[PDB]
Design a protein around this nucleic acid. Structure first.
Ligand SMILES: Cc1cn([C@H]2C[C@H](O)[C@@H](COP(=O)(O)O)O2)c(=O)[nH]c1=O
Ligand SMILES: [Mg+2]
Ligand SMILES: [Mg+2]
Length: 683
DNA sequence: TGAGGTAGTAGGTTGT
DNA sequence: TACTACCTCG
DNA sequence: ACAACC
């Protein structure tokens, strides 16, 4: 490292727990009927809530900061239709030691419920769970935006309250769908009932009368809702054709008077105005302090003391094209890290002629600097020819074309997806560049160029340094359906001079089956074997999010058997809180060790962006020092080739894995058979 | 579809 | 998880 | 149901 510094977390030390709070009441829970296996925990949480006071689940029972006599000790629960009778039996009170982890966990849950409960009786603040919104940040015709904070409250091992505070905004609609449309506002993309929290997707807006509309049951829309007594205080307006978010293939009648639009930033782009909800970190730190003080004051918890942590500045990563670069885009001028002779094709959908002179010039320039030969083909064919177009594609692929650039006006989602999938089935990855295009838009088309090159299989940049792991692979799950795709991507070589993806697998949920984890890993090992002519001495395993229990067990045992060292790191995009400099400036490359095997990592930060959200990492397995892992992950973040001016927050293999399973989730996996693993089709 | 993150808005999974 | 808006271009 | 993540 090149310097240890000091930072604030967005945490605050408050008053010590009083001697009553350290000795909570213990209660035994008795349910009739006794719940089933899968009901016990939700029922325990529910009874902890029905009890009242400040009580939480403790093991099979309850812990409370309220004595039992001021609790609702007897009552009834409803759960999925079934009714349960409950009674709570006082079992004395037992001291909890903050020095001990589990007991501290109980004290912390109690603290959280404390925060919730005291927030509940504030006036007149908009409270939503653990969020509190005081000020009004912005208003408008039928809409307003509130400003406040998301909060949390737990217990330190020294026995004091720790308050986490992070400024937050909240968008609220005040008028119904009918009233909303009565202001010249366009149709919102989403909407919810007024009687419950269920939401819909708003499509058309029919003109059929609600008192003469055949509802799948006999009665009409209008008196169907009137029977439920929904439009008594309300008033049904027009007919709105909504659709289920999980079943959009079945339009449904509804009443504009019984709907309330759910407002997003693209429902307020009309007003434009300003609505910048990102905060400069100085302002966010200020708001954090102010809010922390307010909360500590109104809740009788004392004056906040901003907590401090020792941070370490990490070595600057050394990015390489043919020469050293500061950004991946500079490889276009200097040359790529590695380049074979390549053949790119051009597909024009704007009816215009061949290659734009400046794109051609830039490509020739970059390949000249790389000392590699270039072939610019032009696709003289159009998708509206039908299968003949596919024939054209096949001929292009046979002549050595590796990827094609598609110049087109903005395409609709479906047409974009369909075109890319089609090109994929003929083994051709595609880069789209939108066709109102001027040479002055160099960021857009240099990035398009970079993506194009990554898709042809080139490595535009690489890292220079000594790293513990010679192979780094990321795992993620993606897809917007009942099922998901679990996928892996990798950087092979200490330099990261080879980026590969592997064929994903369909899976029920977020957890990736052990066999699948291993198989993807074996594919990446095989990539390494094929490039280096040996097995890697050490691999860095990067999981997006939490690592489900034993998910990597089989793969880790397999690695052990082959004599390959490993590190498993959980990389969490949220839950890391915030970090602020005690000193002057806030820079990235920041490494903040907290617990053992778990640390924070500020990978990316631009001042014109808001406040950075540091990654939270847990070293789940392996014996590599935290500092080395942080070092390599931080540098790997700089290895991504398809973003020429801004580095991703995630290490390249995870970013890649993510875009891979996202794209497979969109297009489907059926198109990927003839696409080379070296070609990053999904960037 | 230019890319990135920070913001927001919906939704989900894992697991006690 | 995945969407859009904002702003700018290590 | 809630948790700490996606
Ligand atoms: C009763 C009924 C309602 N609906 C639609 C119209 C209602 O506005 C919408 C919402 O009803 P709900 O929220 O009470 O479940 O369901 C049908 O499509 N068919 C039916 O048979
Ligand atoms: Mg994920
Ligand atoms: Mg792309």
């Amino acid at each position: 490292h090149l310097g240890k510094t000091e930072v604030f977390l967005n945490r605050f030390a408050l008053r010590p727990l009083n001697p009553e709070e350290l000795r909570p009441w213990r209660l035994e829970v008795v349910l009739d009927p006794p719940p089933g296996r899968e009901e016990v925990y939700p029922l325990l949480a529910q009874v902890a809530r029905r009890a009242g006071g400040v009580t939480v689940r403790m093991g099979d029972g309850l812990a409370s900061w309220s004595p039992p006599e001021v609790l609702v000790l007897e009552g009834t629960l409803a759960r999925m239709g079934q009714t349960y009778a409950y009674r709570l039996y006082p079992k004395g009170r037992r001291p909890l030691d903050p020095k001990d982890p589990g007991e501290r966990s109980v004290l912390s849950a109690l603290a959280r419920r404390l925060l919730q409960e005291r927030l509940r009786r504030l006036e007149g603040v908009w409270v939503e769970g653990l969020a509190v919104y005081r000020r009004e940040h912005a208003r408008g015709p039928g809409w307003r935006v509130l400003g406040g904070a998301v909060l949390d409250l737990w217990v330190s091992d020294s026995g004091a309250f720790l308050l986490e505070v992070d400024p937050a905004y909240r968008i609220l609609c005040e008028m119904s769908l009918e009233a909303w449309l009565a202001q010249g506002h366009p149709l919102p993309k989403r909407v919810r009932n007024a009687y419950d929290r269920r939401t819909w997707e708003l499509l058309r807006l029919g003109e059929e009368d609600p008192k003469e509309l055949p509802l799948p049951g006999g009665l009409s829309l209008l008196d169907y809702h009137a029977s439920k007594g929904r439009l008594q205080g309300r008033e049904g307006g027009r007919v709105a054709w909504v659709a289920d978010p999980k079943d959009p293939r079945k339009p449904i009648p509804h009443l504009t008077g019984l709907l309330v639009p759910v407002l997003t930033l693209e429902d307020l782009h009309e007003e434009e105005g300003s609505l910048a909800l990102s905060l400069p970190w100085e302002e966010r730190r200020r708001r954090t302090r102010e809010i922390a003080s307010w909360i500590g004051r109104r809740l009788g918890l004392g004056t906040p003391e901003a907590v401090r942590a020792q941070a370490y500045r990490l070595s600057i990563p050394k990015l390489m094209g043919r020469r050293a670069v500061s950004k991946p885009a500079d490889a276009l001028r200097v040359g790529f890290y590695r380049a074979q002779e390549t053949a790119l094709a051009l597909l024009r959908l704007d009816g215009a002629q061949g290659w734009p002179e400046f794109l051609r010039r830039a490509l020739l320039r970059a390949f000249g600097a790389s000392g590699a030969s270039l072939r610019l083909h032009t696709l003289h064919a159009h998708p509206s020819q039908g299968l003949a177009f596919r024939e054209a594609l096949r001929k292009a692929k046979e002549e050595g074309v590796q990827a094609v650039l598609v110049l087109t006006p903005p395409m609709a989602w479906e047409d974009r997806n369909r075109l890319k999938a089609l090109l994929l089935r003929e083994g051709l990855p595609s880069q789209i560049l939108n066709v109102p295009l001027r040479e002055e838009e160099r960021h857009r088309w240099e990035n398009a160029l970079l993506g194009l090159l990554a898709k042809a299989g080139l490595q535009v940049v690489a890292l220079s340094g000594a790293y513990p792991a010679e192979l780094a692979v990321g795992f993620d799950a993606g897809g917007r359906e009942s099922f998901r795709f679990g996928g892996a991507a990798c950087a092979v070589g200490g330099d990261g001079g080879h980026l590969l993806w592997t064929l994903p697998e369909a899976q029920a949920g977020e957890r990736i089956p052990q066999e699948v984890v291993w198989d993807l890993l074996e594919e990446t090992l095989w990539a390494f074997r094929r490039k280096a002519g040996r097995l890697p001495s050490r691999v860095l395993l990067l999981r997006d999010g939490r690592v489900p229990q034993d998910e990597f067990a089989l793969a880790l045992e397999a690695l052990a058997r082959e004599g390959i060292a490993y590190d498993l790191v959980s990389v969490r995009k949220s839950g890391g809180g915030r970090v602020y400099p005690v000193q002057g400036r806030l820079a990235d490359g920041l490494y903040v060790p907290l617990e053992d095997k778990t640390f924070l990592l500020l990978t990316v930060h631009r001042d014109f962006r808001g406040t950075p959200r540091p990654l939270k990492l847990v070293h789940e397995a392996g014996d590599t020092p935290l500092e080395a892992l942080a070092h390599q992950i931080f540098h790997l973040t700089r290895l991504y080739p398809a973003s020429g001016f801004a580095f991703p927050r995630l290490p390249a293999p995870l970013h890649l894995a993510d875009r891979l399973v996202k794209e497979v989730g969109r297009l489907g996996i059926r198109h990927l058979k003839e696409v080379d693993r070296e070609k990053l089709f999904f960037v």
